[PDB]
Every structure is written in structure tokens, then in C-alpha cells.
Amino acid sequence: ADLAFEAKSARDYAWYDVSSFLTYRVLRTGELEVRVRFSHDEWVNVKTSVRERSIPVEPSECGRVNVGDLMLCFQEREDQALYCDGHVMNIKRGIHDHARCNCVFLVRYELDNTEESLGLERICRRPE
Ligand SMILES: [Zn+2]
């Protein structure tokens, strides 16, 4: 029930689970950064690059994912595999039960603006 966090690396713009927070600093420009240890230690901007951890979606609740939603998406390309922000553009709804969702979510990645068709098993929702 404790709050848990993910942080966005300024190295590759992808999100990583935070194990703990070590210290902080203020840049001369006024920006506040925290030093995080990941579940390697990095400085990350508090305002833009630390948030409550994204949440897996169970097959029985795939209806809660809607066009326009911000999702954390598993983006696998070549031998690179990053968790990146995307927005759901389109949903092809499938016939399925509680065991496995077969709906297809077309996502558009925020950073490079590319699109990919993903299953529920590669996307996580934001809290609230
Ligand atoms: Zn579904």
C-alpha cells in the first residue's frame, strides 16, 4: 500500500522502477533533481521525471483503457527493450474472457511519434 515510483532516465528517455532515493540537488537554474537507485544510480528531474509507478491492467478490466489514455508501453526494437510513454490511438476489441485479453491497442509513442500495435500484456496504465 506504500507509494512506489518510476523515474525517467535522461539517457534514453525511458522509465525505470525506483528502488530508493539517495539525495537531492538544485541546479543553478533552480531545477530540483533527486538521485535515484533503480530496482546505475542517476540524477533525475523531480517535476518531469519522477512519478507514481504505472500499473498492470488485468484482462477483466481492459475496458478501462480508452483512446487518448497515456500508457507506459513495452517498446521492443532490435535488441533494445524500453518502457516508453505512448497514447492509445485506436482499439480493436476482441472476444475474450478473464484469462487473457486479445484486444489490440494502437499506440503512438510520445518521443519519436512512431506507432505500434500492442496487446494488453505490453501496456501499463497510470494511477487515478
Ligand atoms: Zn480486451
From Swiss-Prot:
Phenotype when changing H96A: Decreased stability of the protein. Decreased stability of the protein
Effect of C103A: Decreased stability of the protein
Annotated spans, SAWADEE domain: 14-115
Binding-site residues for Zn(2+), renumbered to this chain: C62, H96, C101, C103
Gene disruption: observed consequences: Loss of DRM2 controlled DNA methylation, but no effect on CMT3 or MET1 controlled methylation.
Reported effect, E6A: DNA methylation defects
Protein localization: Nucleus
Variant or mutagenesis effect after changing D17A: Strong DNA methylation defects
UniProt effect for mutating Y16A: Loss of interaction with H3K9 and DNA methylation defects
Chain's role: Involved in RNA-directed DNA methylation (RdDM). Required for the silencing of some endogenous RdDM targets and accumulation of 24-nt siRNAs, but not for the production of Pol V-dependent transcripts. Functions in transcriptional silencing through both DNA methylation-dependent and -independent pathways. Required for both maintenance and de-novo DNA methylation. Plays a role in the recruitment of Pol IV to genomic regions associated with K9 methylated histone H3 that are targets for RdDM.
Note: Associates in vivo with Pol IV but not with Pol V and this interaction is not dependent on its H3K9me binding activity.
Domain notes for this protein: The SAWADEE domain (138-244) binds to mono-, di-, or trimethylated H3K9 histone peptides, but this interaction is impaired if H3K4me2/3 methylation is present.
Subunit comment: Associates with the RNA polymerase IV (Pol IV) complex. Interacts with NRPD1, NRPD2, NRPD3, NRPD3B, CLSY1 and CLSY2.
Name of the protein in question: Protein SAWADEE HOMEODOMAIN HOMOLOG 1
Biological classification of the source: Eukaryota, Viridiplantae, Streptophyta, Embryophyta, Tracheophyta
Gene coding for it: SHH1
